[PDB]
Amino acid sequence: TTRRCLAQMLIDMEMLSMPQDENCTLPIYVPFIEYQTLSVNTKSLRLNSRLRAIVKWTDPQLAWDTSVYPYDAVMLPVDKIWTPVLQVKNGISTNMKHDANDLLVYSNGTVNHEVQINAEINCEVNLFNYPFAGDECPVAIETFSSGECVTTLILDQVRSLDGSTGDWQTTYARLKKQREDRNFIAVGLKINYSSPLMTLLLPTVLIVLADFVSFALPLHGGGRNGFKVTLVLSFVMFLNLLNSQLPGNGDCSPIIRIHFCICLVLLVLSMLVSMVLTRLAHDGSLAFFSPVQMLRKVVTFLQRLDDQKNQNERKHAFADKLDKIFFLFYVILGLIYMCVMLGIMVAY
Amino acid sequence: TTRRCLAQMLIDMEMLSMPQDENCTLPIYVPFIEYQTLSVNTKSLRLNSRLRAIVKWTDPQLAWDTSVYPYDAVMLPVDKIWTPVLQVKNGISTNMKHDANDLLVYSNGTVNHEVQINAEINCEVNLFNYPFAGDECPVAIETFSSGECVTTLILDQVRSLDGSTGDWQTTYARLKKQREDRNFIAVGLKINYSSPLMTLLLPTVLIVLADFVSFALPLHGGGRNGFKVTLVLSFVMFLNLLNSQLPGNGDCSPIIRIHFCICLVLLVLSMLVSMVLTRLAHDGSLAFFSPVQMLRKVVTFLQRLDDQKNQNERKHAFADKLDKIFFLFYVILGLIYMCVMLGIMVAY
Amino acid sequence: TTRRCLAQMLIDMEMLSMPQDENCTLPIYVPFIEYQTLSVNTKSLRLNSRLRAIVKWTDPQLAWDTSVYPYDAVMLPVDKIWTPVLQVKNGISTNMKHDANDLLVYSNGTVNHEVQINAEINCEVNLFNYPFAGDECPVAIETFSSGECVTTLILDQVRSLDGSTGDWQTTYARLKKQREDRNFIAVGLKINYSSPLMTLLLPTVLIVLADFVSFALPLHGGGRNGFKVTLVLSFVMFLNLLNSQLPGNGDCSPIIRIHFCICLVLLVLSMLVSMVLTRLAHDGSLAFFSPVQMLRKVVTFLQRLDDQKNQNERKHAFADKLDKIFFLFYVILGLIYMCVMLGIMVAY
Amino acid sequence: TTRRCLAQMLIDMEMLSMPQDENCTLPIYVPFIEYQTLSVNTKSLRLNSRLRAIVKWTDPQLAWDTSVYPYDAVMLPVDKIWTPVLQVKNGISTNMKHDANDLLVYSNGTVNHEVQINAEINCEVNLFNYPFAGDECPVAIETFSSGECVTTLILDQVRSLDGSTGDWQTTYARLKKQREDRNFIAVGLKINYSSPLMTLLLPTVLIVLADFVSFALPLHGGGRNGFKVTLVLSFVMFLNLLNSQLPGNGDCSPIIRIHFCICLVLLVLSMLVSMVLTRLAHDGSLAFFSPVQMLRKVVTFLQRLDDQKNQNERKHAFADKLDKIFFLFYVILGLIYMCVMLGIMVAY
Amino acid sequence: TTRRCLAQMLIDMEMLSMPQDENCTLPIYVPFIEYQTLSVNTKSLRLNSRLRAIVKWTDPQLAWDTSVYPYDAVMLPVDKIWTPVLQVKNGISTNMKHDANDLLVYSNGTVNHEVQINAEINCEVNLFNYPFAGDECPVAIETFSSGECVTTLILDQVRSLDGSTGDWQTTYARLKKQREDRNFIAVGLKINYSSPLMTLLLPTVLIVLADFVSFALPLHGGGRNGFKVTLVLSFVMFLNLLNSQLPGNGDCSPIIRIHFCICLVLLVLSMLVSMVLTRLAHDGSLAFFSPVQMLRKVVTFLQRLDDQKNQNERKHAFADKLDKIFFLFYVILGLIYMCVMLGIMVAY
Ligand SMILES: *[C@@H]1O[C@H](CO)[C@@H](O)[C@H](O)[C@H]1NC(C)=O
Numbered sequence A, B, C, D, E: 001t002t003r004r005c006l007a008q009m010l011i012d013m014e015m016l017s018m019p020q021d022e023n024c025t026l027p028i029y030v031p032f033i034e035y036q037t038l039s040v041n042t043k044s045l046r047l048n049s050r051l052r053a054i055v056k057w058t059d060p061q062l063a064w065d066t067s068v069y070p071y072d073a074v075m076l077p078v079d080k081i082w083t084p085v086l087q088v089k090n091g092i093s094t095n096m097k098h099d100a101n102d103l104l105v106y107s108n109g110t111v112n113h114e115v116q117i118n119a120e121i122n123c124e125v126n127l128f129n130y131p132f133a134g135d136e137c138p139v140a141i142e143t144f145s146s147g148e149c150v151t152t153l154i155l156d157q158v159r160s161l162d163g164s165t166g167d168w169q170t171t172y173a174r175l176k177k178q179r180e181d182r183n184f185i186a187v188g189l190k191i192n193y194s195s196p197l198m199t200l201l202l203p204t205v206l207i208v209l210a211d212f213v214s215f216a217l218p219l220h221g222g223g224r225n226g227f228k229v230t231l232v233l234s235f236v237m238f239l240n241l242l243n244s245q246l247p248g249n250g251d252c253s254p255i256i257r258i259h260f261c262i263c264l265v266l267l268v269l270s271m272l273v274s275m276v277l278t279r280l281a282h283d284g285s286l287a288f289f290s291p292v293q294m295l296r297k298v299v300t301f302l303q304r305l306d307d308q309k310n311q312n313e314r315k316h317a318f319a320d321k322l323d324k325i326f327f328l329f330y331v332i333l334g335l336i337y338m339c340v341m342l343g344i345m346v347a348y
């Protein structure tokens, strides 16, 4: 007659099989399932999610008579009776664990029990515009159903612990329905571009601008070839660091990688042209690559020195003319390309 | 009749259900719960904590008669009877582990048993003033309670193994109460700024000072543009290192990131101005960007050389005047900005 | 008479041994096995795979009479009866995991049950042409069979969730057969060379081309020896980065490592000869390594100055001639070597 | 009458409670416990240890009669009887694991069984003098004891597998007793200073010596400010590397961090002074920061050039003298500081 | 009479104790044990191994009568009877895993069953000659044996899956015997020096050669001190990277560390002497460290300029002589040291 006695008798019943008597169709209600994001990986595009759900089903064999047992509820260990397992079929490595060791059972057979599902979903995201990206990820929630025996799952509400999970920010988690009456959660993922814009795009933009203005350095004065090779080996490091953390899979791959490649090529070409111009200024032609008498001798020497200085000036001015032409052309194309690349990366 | 026989009888009773006889309300006492911090993550803002608690509850069915059994205590395996599970509902990934395989039971039904809860809590900390930051983190301690059946938790004292856990230092762990009679522990986390200030803030401040002094280098003499390009590509590396370990989530994001961005922009602007001044000094105008007779001829040559030297001096002096004006302007704005930025980062 | 009663009776049968009555030969059918790649490691050449299979076998003892029990199916817990374990013998660390806690059993003894095998396979791949590489990996699927008792496994179809797993791309998963009637899955792995070509090959090619054009810098003008030492010390970093992520095992090791080594050696040789040429130009020979009168005196001084300048010019032109000869030789040899190495790395 | 029959009957007795008949006091003997260190973490100051112990206790219920059963020993599974669990109360994450599945039981009740305890101990070591450091770490060995029931643990001998565990070297492991009759193991940890010395201290000392010598570089000749900026940025990198792997907790924090900070400050000050001196030499004053006639005119020009050359020589010599005075003072201070810091780091 | 009925009766026998009837001495035969290496760590010198063994023992109680049961073999679950646990006593963290959930038992009591042992062995390797190193590692295979009860292990053959495991290459795995009749496996580990020689030794060799040839750069011309300081801060990075992956334990520590230290010291000394020679050339003495009239005056100025240029030439030649003497010393000493160190690192 004790409530503990009722619990013990229910344990001794050993009902470790599901209530499949009614045509092997068990309606399982899961109201108020709470979703949370634990991490997001950008290189692998994999989402770690935690879903705390409240399963509520019916077990007719676990229903006593109220007259003999004057109680309305009883708490039993989870492993001493049957309990459904909830799966994330869409993702890999799904694991369901029990929040508590005890579950409540009412006098009419209703069973309430809270569970936690940790899942890893191979999310597909349109990462073409890094970092200005964001997309919707489906997460399937399913319970076992094979052939004739099918246990429908009825879901009511979803609550999301929305908040940044690192670089990525989870915006919403809504409940939608699939084609074959499959319930799933649509999770909206977005990228906070405040970090990538400052750490990646801004330094490269300033570096390209510095290269554009680097043509002010005179060829003869020096401090120009080293200045540009420093930029080149810095942009190579940038390319390596960018490649270390973005997926170069296939169609709609991130376009920042191609932009870095093109900027590196442009910088290398500019440095090459600068070095060739330096040689032209120094030598005067690009042939390196291709295979009272005492009072008179003094004015002869003086005019010889003057003529030498004049030739030095002329050969230092011709290369300056060529450098000016190339600088105008290069700066125009570089600015137009940078504007086009930004317009593509933000609105395409 | 032996104590081992009594223990075996209690094992054979198989009371694996909760002592829910008295209206399904079991008061669980947890006096002297010890808290310790294992790690703190600054980027993800996640706290790993270990709580060693001493649960002490009542099991009426596990109470023998003292006259037949002349003993006052008996130790039984934890898995052979019922035991409550303690949870950290506020945080993710909570696991409760049995410290020992045995528990003590008195003759009046009281059961003493110690447990260890390892939990990971998504801590919310105001990280605006990195590294001068510190805040209070709630850690909930809860046990299962559903519907009619509730088992209240009564907590008495908290002891903290206070000590640095890396960059972060745990200051205190007090016991407070929530709204709906929920017991929780408030943990005070603080940042030891001795490490971040030396490794991060001091080198950047000294580099900025070196940039402010860098204008002393003569434009014609060289060694100025490469000197600043080294600083710029070092500050880019500093920005990357800062972005690697700080959360750029949203409002009240760390201000050191914006400070590094602004310092980098100022350095790049100083470089551009210096390079333009170098071109102006070399060429004389910013048009590169914009599209007895023997005894007399020697005097002509000498005065021509003297005039050329005078022109060289004048073009090297005009750029010096412009550089001085820009240096005064830039140094005043830089000092005022650095003072304002430190004032913001310290007391805002 | 209840279906739950039938399930309980089958549970109480306790049939935890395999149906080996028929000559200890159990045919196990596994139709529609789905293969997916989780990760591929290039340095260790290890493949992580997940195989979701649908096992379907026969258990004669688990077959009831339809007249007494008017049902066609029943779902029982997986651990209450015997279930085969599927292994990946070819690879290491194979683990079979239960998809659900229930399995369906028909009235004639047929049992349907889904399993998930996670395996890690030591894959052998011809990585000579990094990154233009691709190969077929065998994955064995087997069940326990010792001596007289054998359980043949009959497979029907394989479905692959083809898609990039990082750097590597899985193309197909077909079903083939081994010699001794062993069923296995051939998985086609390919490398997306878009990432390695941009991050590794292109910067090195551009750096090498820059080294070839660096000979334009005059010996006296400076900015040349440092320009080359930066390239050499950057190529050392490239060699380290390349070594950090590629298996240098033995025969048919990646040839990009040898190519990087040879390019570094060539750059070092070019720098050495350039520095020797600089010394020759400065000193005039490679011996450092080897152990009216007033109106006339001015003419003498002017002639001495002119002769000194003439000697400087001649000693600066001889080294220019030597540098031109070496530049022609070096450029021709380096271009032919680069073309040959690319031809080897692409189509050999 | 079979030994296997005796083992089966002992198993069937189901003695899963501890031998608490004798006043609930069980003397547990653990002779010849072997200690080994698996790893030491310098940043977190956490010790990973493995202890292979040989527990030997008494179980009166597991004692048969020799006349009926003519045997002296029997081996039983560990899980079929009671076995004590050994804990490391001082440290976190203590786990006890059975070395074998079987244990030996004698005819008089004595039970021999070997166990392995893996523990993580939060070690407190005086790391002020990195790397010349070393200290004694206590490791508690304890078994469950609550209230009236206590089971004392009697230890005899400790043997340690001495050998370097990375940077740290374990020297000894002795057995001592605490205040409240608690047995513990004192482990002597020491740092092999050869690796940290050669990788951190010697390069920094050599860099500081190079900085002290760098004053020989002439102000006008160039190649000086780039040298010092390379030194300073390399020292900042060293500061970052040092901060990445040393605990900056509080009092008696490693003093190498302060030494690196002070040396960096000194280098920056030397750079600033050198740049200001260079400007003074170039300009002549620190005001940039503060807001027959033909035969005669040639003599005028020549004396003007001579005067200008003399002024250039004087303004170079004044800066040379100032640089000499600063060099003397700076080198004296630097040598005295380096010697004092070495003395503090080695013998304080 | 059914084979399944025979298996069920064997399961119901519940023989979970070792077959210890015959003097508690059980001969366990393990023929054809296969060894494989999973990973080798160079810094910690720890070997990860997988051993797939085929245990074959005798269980007299698990033997039926052939006349009543006309069968020769039967398959039983591994957990329903006794099974030995194979251990790796020499190494840490040994785990034995069941290859299958079933085992075969013959009519005469013989039991065949394969197991998998994963072990981690603290290997002792003579790493003095890195990378030209290689040594033999013992791996113990043992079963539980305490006091009177001893289970001998009889091993027949070992087959090894030879193949590179990263940097390390496993050559052989033979079976030997210890002193006290203990069976163990000797595994031959060797280092593929193709990777370390290319990534570590060769770049340092060319860097050293570049330092030796760097003396060609003239003192006055510049581009020398920066060239050497770049090499010095590159060699410091090499020292750090080498220290990151090699064990500096004690006697017979790798000599490449000492070699890198000595090369760095030599480079620093060469840089220091070059920087001193620069000042000697510029100033003329090492005292910085130590505390018709018109037609005639023009001749006076001209001869003064000539004398000044003559003094410049003489002071630029004396330092050249000193530099030549030092270079003749230094190149010979360094070449002899490099040859001696290579001879030591190869054949000592
Ligand atoms: C069982 O009783 C509970 C308690 O009110 C109620 O919520 C539930 O709907 C009932 N279920 C059925 C099938 O009557």
Ligand SMILES: *[C@@H]1O[C@H](CO)[C@@H](O)[C@H](O)[C@H]1NC(C)=O
Pocket: B106, B108, B109, B110
């Ligand atoms: C049971 O006895 C213990 C031992 O003194 C005591 O601490 C506890 O308060 C008692 N509980 C009750 C309900 O009497």
Ligand SMILES: *[C@@H]1O[C@H](CO)[C@@H](O)[C@H](O)[C@H]1NC(C)=O
Pocket: C106, C108, C109, C110
């Ligand atoms: C058992 O019945 C199922 C259901 O139709 C069928 O698919 C299967 O082939 C049958 N097996 C045998 C052996 O009759």
Ligand SMILES: *[C@@H]1O[C@H](CO)[C@@H](O)[C@H](O)[C@H]1NC(C)=O
Pocket: D106, D108, D109, D110
């Ligand atoms: C039991 O016998 C063993 C075997 O000699 C002995 O070592 C041990 O001391 C004995 N213990 C007692 C309590 O007699």
Ligand SMILES: *[C@@H]1O[C@H](CO)[C@@H](O)[C@H](O)[C@H]1NC(C)=O
Pocket: E106, E108, E109, E110
């Ligand atoms: C048992 O029979 C098997 C099968 O031939 C044989 O290999 C084994 O040696 C036999 N063992 C004994 C003890 O007879």
